[PDB]
Amino acid sequence: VLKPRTLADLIRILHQLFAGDEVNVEEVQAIMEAYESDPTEWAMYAKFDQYRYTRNLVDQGNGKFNLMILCWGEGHGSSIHDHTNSHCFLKMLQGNLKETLFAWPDKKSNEMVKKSERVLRENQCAYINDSIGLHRVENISHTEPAVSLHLYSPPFDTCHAFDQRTGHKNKVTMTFHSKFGIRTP
Ligand SMILES: [Fe+2]
């Protein structure tokens, strides 16, 4: 696999990968994973919040995708969510995330079913889409932070958040804590 030597190279390569109409998921996953995380290259995007994780936009991929960095503070986690019909890749940059895959709820109301559960390792890149399942992702440590790099294509502004007890969902607008290293409003 082609190995980006720096986040810049990776981004460059991504522009090519998503330039077309076809996307080789396997191939992208490989290239994201090959990139060996280097805090020096991404610290400018590593802006944490005390209470919840943060989204820091990194690149807009010429409209073809969103490359962002999420910063999980001690014990921070996400909700069980979908991915608005887009491709979604997440690669570990620091620390470890526990990913739990869930099955889509029905009209009926009741406890959501876990389909898979694992821990993403160092520099590991995972992949997901709506036809695969819903998921929840969490920092496994209560003393160290976690940092992941995320790519969505096409990009999307909203997602659904699921209630693990009933499967009830609600629309959520996704916001950014910072863009291009710049804290937002
Ligand atoms: Fe997700």
UniProtKB/Swiss-Prot annotation:
<keyword id="KW-0560">Oxidoreductase</keyword>
<dbReference type="GO" id="GO:0008270">
    <property type="term" value="F:zinc ion binding"/>
</dbReference>
<dbReference type="GO" id="GO:0042412">
    <property type="term" value="P:taurine biosynthetic process"/>
</dbReference>
<feature type="binding site">
    <location>
        <position position="81"/>
    </location>
    <ligand>
        <name>Fe cation</name>
    </ligand>
</feature>
<dbReference type="InterPro" id="IPR014710">
    <property type="entry name" value="RmlC-like_jellyroll"/>
</dbReference>
<dbReference type="GO" id="GO:0097184">
    <property type="term" value="P:response to azide"/>
</dbReference>
<dbReference type="GO" id="GO:0051384">
    <property type="term" value="P:response to glucocorticoid"/>
</dbReference>
<dbReference type="InterPro" id="IPR010300">
    <property type="entry name" value="CDO_1"/>
</dbReference>
<dbReference type="GO" id="GO:0016151">
    <property type="term" value="F:nickel cation binding"/>
</dbReference>
<dbReference type="GO" id="GO:0006954">
    <property type="term" value="P:inflammatory response"/>
</dbReference>
<dbReference type="Pfam" id="PF05995">
    <property type="entry name" value="CDO_I"/>
</dbReference>
<protein>
    <recommendedName>
        <fullName>Cysteine dioxygenase type 1</fullName>
        <ecNumber>1.13.11.20</ecNumber>
    </recommendedName>
</protein>
<dbReference type="GO" id="GO:0043200">
    <property type="term" value="P:response to amino acid"/>
</dbReference>
<dbReference type="GO" id="GO:0008198">
    <property type="term" value="F:ferrous iron binding"/>
</dbReference>
<dbReference type="GO" id="GO:0000097">
    <property type="term" value="P:sulfur amino acid biosynthetic process"/>
</dbReference>
<dbReference type="GO" id="GO:0007595">
    <property type="term" value="P:lactation"/>
</dbReference>
<dbReference type="GO" id="GO:0006534">
    <property type="term" value="P:cysteine metabolic process"/>
</dbReference>
<keyword id="KW-0883">Thioether bond</keyword>
<comment type="similarity">
    <text>Belongs to the cysteine dioxygenase family.</text>
</comment>
<dbReference type="GO" id="GO:0045471">
    <property type="term" value="P:response to ethanol"/>
</dbReference>
<comment type="subunit">
    <text>Monomer.</text>
</comment>
<feature type="cross-link" description="3'-(S-cysteinyl)-tyrosine (Cys-Tyr)">
    <location>
        <begin position="88"/>
        <end position="152"/>
    </location>
</feature>
<keyword id="KW-0408">Iron</keyword>
<feature type="binding site">
    <location>
        <position position="83"/>
    </location>
    <ligand>
        <name>Fe cation</name>
    </ligand>
</feature>
<dbReference type="GO" id="GO:0005829">
    <property type="term" value="C:cytosol"/>
</dbReference>
<comment type="pathway">
    <text>Organosulfur biosynthesis; taurine biosynthesis; hypotaurine from L-cysteine: step 1/2.</text>
</comment>
<dbReference type="GO" id="GO:0019448">
    <property type="term" value="P:L-cysteine catabolic process"/>
</dbReference>
<keyword id="KW-0479">Metal-binding</keyword>
<feature type="binding site">
    <location>
        <position position="135"/>
    </location>
    <ligand>
        <name>Fe cation</name>
    </ligand>
</feature>
<dbReference type="InterPro" id="IPR011051">
    <property type="entry name" value="RmlC_Cupin_sf"/>
</dbReference>
<dbReference type="GO" id="GO:0051591">
    <property type="term" value="P:response to cAMP"/>
</dbReference>
<dbReference type="GO" id="GO:0033762">
    <property type="term" value="P:response to glucagon"/>
</dbReference>
<keyword id="KW-0223">Dioxygenase</keyword>
<comment type="function">
    <text>Catalyzes the oxidation of cysteine to cysteine sulfinic acid with addition of molecular dioxygen.</text>
</comment>
<dbReference type="GO" id="GO:0017172">
    <property type="term" value="F:cysteine dioxygenase activity"/>
</dbReference>
